[PDB]
Design an enzyme around this catalytic site. Structure first.
Site: not given
Ligand SMILES: [Cl-]
Ligand SMILES: [Cl-]
Length: 162
Positions: A11, A20, A32, A104, A117, A132
């Site tokens: 990040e 972002d 965010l 996250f 998945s 996948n």
């Protein structure tokens, strides 16, 4: 290496409001603020989160504090999610960190949709799950980060991060 270091690498850290990869207002270590197109709306969400008139700038400590809350929330959301919990319970420690990273980034709801998945991970079919996971918008939009998380699930080691 651990979850915190891992996400800190994925990040980064910014002390002022920025946009972002999706063009949303963010601050700190991937926190965010809002999906709204308004800077003011973001400034308002920011001061509400920190508890002071920030003017769109925070300090390192404040960023780290948002980070700690965010990581805690993700873990806790995983544990309360009926689709996520069992996958997480099934995994080893390194791989648990990869699932947290995804939550996250994309939110619990976003992740719970990787149904297929999820099943593969649960069954410990590492190579198939990796294949996948890669057929997703997630992988096409943020390929380098996605590749790191994918390798983590594939290998069970932190190699992608060293
Ligand atoms: Cl908050
Ligand atoms: Cl990327």
């Amino acid at each position: 290496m651990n979850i915190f270091e891992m996400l800190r690498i994925d990040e980064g850290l910014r002390l002022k409001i920025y946009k972002d990869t999706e063009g949303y207002y963010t601050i700190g270590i991937g926190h965010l603020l809002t999906k709204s197109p308004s800077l003011n709306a973001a400034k308002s969400e920011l001061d509400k989160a920190i508890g002071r008139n920030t003017n769109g700038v925070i300090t390192k400590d404040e960023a780290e504090k948002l980070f700690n809350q965010d990581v805690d929330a993700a873990v806790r959301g995983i544990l309360r999610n009926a689709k996520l919990k069992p996958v997480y319970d099934s995994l080893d420690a390194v791989r648990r960190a990869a699932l947290i990273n995804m939550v996250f980034q994309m939110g619990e709801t976003g992740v719970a949709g990787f149904t297929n998945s999820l099943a593969m991970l649960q069954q410990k079919r590492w190579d198939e799950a990796a294949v996948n996971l890669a057929k997703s918008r997630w992988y096409n939009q943020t390929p380098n980060r996605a590749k790191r998380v994918i390798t983590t699930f594939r290998t069970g080691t932190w190699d992608a991060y060293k």
